[PDB]
């Protein structure tokens, strides 16, 4: 009973909310892996100019 009450409290009406969460997570992760090369370039080359 306690576990069911806690699960109902945590997952009351989060259907569309969790759907958006998962969809946004997967889209962001996929696009990030697609653009990992510019990300790596920024990470590796931003230090010189800024420290200069």
């Amino acid at each position: 009973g306690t576990l069911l009450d806690e699960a109902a409290t945590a997952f009351g009406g989060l259907g569309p909310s969790l759907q958006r969460l998962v969809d946004s997570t997967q889209a962001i992760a996929g696009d990030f892996r697609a653009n990992i090369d510019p990300v790596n370039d920024i990470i590796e080359n931003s230090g010189p100019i800024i420290d200069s």
Binding site: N40, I43, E44, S46, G47, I50, D51
Partner: protein, 51 residues
């Protein structure tokens, strides 16, 4: 693997922000007066070219 470089970038960003914050007011006052003299020069572009 690029995490020390991330740390370097963050520290450099903080230091550059501090330096820019220290140097900004003088730069912006100079930019205001430079806009004044730039409008002056633009109003007499023909005179400057003839000169």
């Amino acid at each position: 693997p690029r995490m020390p470089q991330i740390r370097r970038d963050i520290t450099g960003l903080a230091n550059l922000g501090e330096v820019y914050a220290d140097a900004s007011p003088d730069l912006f006052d100079g930019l205001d007066n430079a806009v004044t003299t730039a409008r002056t020069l633009n109003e007499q572009r023909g005179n400057l070219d003839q000169a």
